[PDB]
Amino acid sequence: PYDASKWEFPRDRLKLGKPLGRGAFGQVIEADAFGIDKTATCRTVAVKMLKEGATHSEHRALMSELKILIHIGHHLNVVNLLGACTKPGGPLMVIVEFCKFGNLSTYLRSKRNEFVPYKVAPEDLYKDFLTLEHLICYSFQVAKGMEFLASRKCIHRDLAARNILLSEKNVVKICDFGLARDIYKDPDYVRKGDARLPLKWMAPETIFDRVYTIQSDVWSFGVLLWEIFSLGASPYPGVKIDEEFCRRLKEGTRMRAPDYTTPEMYQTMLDCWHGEPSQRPTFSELVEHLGNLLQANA
Template sequence: MELTNHICTHFELYEVDAGRSGTSVVAVKTLKENAAEKERADLLQELQVMKMLEPHPNVVRLLGCCTEKDPVFLIMEYVALGKLQSFLRNSRAERCYGNLHGPSNTLTSRDLTTFVYQVARGMEFLSNKGIIHRDLAARNVLVDEGHICKVADFGFARDVIASHVYERKSEGRLPIRWMAPESLYDNVFSVKSDVWSFGVLMWEVVTLGSTPYPGMAAADVMRKVRDGYRLDKPEHCRRELYNIMYYCWDRDPKERPSFQELVQLLEQLLLSETEYIELERFPDHSYYNMVSLSGEKL
């Protein structure tokens, strides 16, 4: 496989020689110079997880790797529209532009409901393989040109097929706003802690990429989640959709739904053809996006 046309660093795009079909663009994930040994270990762990997976339409696909000498490369499919988080945030400007200047390609309620359904399908596939993601969030889902969502970024993921539970041993920046209470306080991760994160991702999608727990510091989030506080229902979100989010946030992991059940619940909403996200009522003033906070992954 010949790689050409080096464009950027760390996460890079290349054109590859695809034989008779010409060239294809791929994404190549590698390490920056002077990367810490832990980052190298995380990249190799990500590779081990992705090597276990056969292709699935809602999971980013590994195409190849180079590990015989440094730097290590992971060669993955290129997903053209980038991160779901950015895609949702950019759609706000598109929506305003459309309101001012006539029709535009704005997202609809059905689009957004389909996004969460697709992520649930990807996570159902991973959980059936005995894999926990541990960092499920809109920033780690990619969107292709056909508006197909693909779960990505397996740097935190672990194969837990034997025990079904993973206990974190090392420190680092954490996705606090997406973490279940047992992960925040006991360092325990499971498929059911991924389900909690999925509920937060649903809230992100409904609010077009807003930062969860707006206006609250990380320490306040941790304390209030432990004490039973949950993200409020957005005023433009119908109760049926919010109830699925809330179901994901049960204090008892055993009481949370499985991803298989979430797929079924979301499929029922799509079949009903009701608008569960009333975007004409979207309150821009109520939500905002935080881009960096000390010690947090956002």
Template sequence: MPVSASYRWSPFCVDGVTTVAVKTLKENAAEVEKKDLLSELEVMKSLDPHVNVVRFLGCCTDKDPIFVIIEYVNRGKLQTYLRNSRAERHYGNTHGKSNILTSGDLTSFMYQVAKGMDYLTSRGIIHRDLAARNILITDDHTCKVADFGFARDVVTSKIYERKSEGKLPIRWMATESLYDNIFSVKSDIWSFGILMWEIVTLGSTPYPGISAADVMRKVRDGYRLEKPEHCRRELYNIMYYCWSSDSNERPTFLEVVQMLDKLLHTEMDYIELERFPDHNYYNIVNLSGEKL
């Protein structure tokens, strides 16, 4: 499940039948974190069930600690799942059924996340922290957008200006978010393009070998993540489209859904995993001041 330093997740059984996940604050959580959890709760309460969005089940807010109850998604974070798949691909699987992912699986993950985000967009929700670490995955490869701690309901203005600071997901953020604190559906689209790159590289950290400060400068100056050598141009073009400097030139989530659907209906492997260059990619788990 998604975890931050101030949250605690607990899966447990209700009536011996349904396992759920409970999100609550740790005892040392700051007031701003309580505010974020309540904001996340309000966003989730406003949503109807959608197969590609983690489902809100209930809450307890009449006294501290606050509990937010959601569906339990048994495979956990997509980022971890992808990284484990890379290890399995490298070392092989000698015990039971293989879980090695295919090009079709990976393209389907992108398509499902785009479907979930298209639904959230239709409800006036900006996620603001879209990344593989905030997507959950089930045993049957259903992907669910999760972790709405930074999400905002901006149904009136369609744009949100961040006022508070904290660890930022710099490598996933659009130029206007990095430099002007402006978040919109189109900044979520930028993040989705980065998430596509994460999926293609089986959970690698974006901009490997480049510091956060250099990422910010280089992206502002027009630098973009390069096409992975095992990724076909047709798929990379969708990512690149998401990274237009002019936010108005980026696609909508509905357009991304349609583009990915078209790729899924061909016989082509757009991610040539037999050519996966494992040595080129890195899993960075901790950098000071950065959200990874």
């Protein structure tokens, strides 16, 4: 359902700005919302809306997404829904908290040179570098977000570092650009049947049987871990994404360890990549595991 008394935000109280992500039919825009949260307070927000080319079907899909985000609720590691513009005579707009640093994939890749496994040096004390603690922390935060989302009976279907955002104080948030990404222009999406699917993140039961579950999200999570500990590299490097790739993956062929991983983190990847979906760990198990890794790290 949609409770307008709670979620409806007047279009006039929203000041639209620069594009944040653009698709063919959808887009995410930066905006200035007046009193969306705390009474009479300006706040930077990100708005998802449709663009030229979009049809009634994309409009329907955007309303479903808004209703799903309403149903989800608040969690520190899930992008937070602030409101919506659903009234006639204007476009449908889904408003969320702004995440300053953008997607995790671009962010890690940009900071790849500023990576030091451990900050042991006394001179390095006052420098904003990426450490193994930071990477384990992001991995653990995504798992807490995915555990929360699992408890809400949701399935993501496109978990990847491109769908993780970085906010202030190293807080990561799960998101879904969806229509705000041009998948027909994007290389992470490969043509399979009548659609463009994120093949490199998909579990084998999804590539062949089109079966999406919380455990197939765990597989994607394993691929996301590879993205994190590769510092934003593209999965399966040098591999042609075709029928031979799909065949080998079902047989048990896995990715090699990324250049910045710890043996245990690659083991956690391998566990997430177990062929049988029931044998892959749960998000609740990954929270405790990654939580222990972060406590041992200190």
